[PDB]
Structures are given as C-alpha cells and as structure tokens.
C-alpha cells in the first residue's frame, strides 16, 4: 500500500524517570507530532 | 513491517527529545531534562 507515515514508540528517561512516549512522523515532510508521553512507567 | 524493532541510535534519541521538548511546553510533568532513550523502540507504518 501506500505509506501516510510512521509513529514511534518509545521509553524516554527524563529528569532521572521513565516515560512512555508515542510520535507521529509524516512520510514526506518527517513533521512530528507528539501523541502521548505517560509515566513514570516501569522499566521494560 | 507495519510494526518493526528500530535501533536507540541517534535518530531514535533525537526522538526522545523532541518527545521531551514538546512535552516541557504542555507542562504536565513540570520541566523536564532529557536523559536517553532505552531499548525497546518500536516503528510502526502507517498505510492508506
């Protein structure tokens, strides 16, 4: 098919603790959007 | 494919800090200093 774009999830330690964080990102234009950041969550 | 395991090579931090950096200006964590991003990342494709 396409492909609209992509979304990465991710662990991201931030001030010493552990988030989730889920990006967007465009094919074309690699424009980013941030779609969720949670946490503190335990580590993987 | 559609869901893969991606490297935490530069690009893969480089997401983390923007995930970081767009956070800080919600504010909903108070501020925030970018430490790393850990194993695992994942990529999923969108289609359509």
């Known amino acids: ?3 609209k774009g992509y979304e ?3 662990y991201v330690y931030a001030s010493d ?3 989730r964080a889920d990006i967007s990102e465009d094919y074309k234009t690699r424009g980013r959007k941030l779609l969720r950041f949670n946490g503190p969550v335990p580590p993987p | ?3 893969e395991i991606i490297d935490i090579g530069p690009f893969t931090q480089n997401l983390g800090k923007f995930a970081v950096d767009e956070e800080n200006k919600i504010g909903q964590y108070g ?3 970018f430490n790393k991003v850990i ?3 994942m ?3 969108i289609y359509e």
Do not use: A, D, S, V
Request: with cysteine.
């Open chain 2, 43 to 45: 990529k999923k494709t």
């Open chain 2, 31 to 33: 501020r925030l200093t």
């Open chain 1, 17 to 19: 603790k552990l988030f």
């Open chain 1, 8 to 10: 990465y999830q991710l």
């Open chain 2, 1 to 3: 494919g559609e869901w």
């Open chain 1, 1 to 3: 098919r396409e492909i």
């Open chain 2, 39 to 41: 194993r695992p990342c």
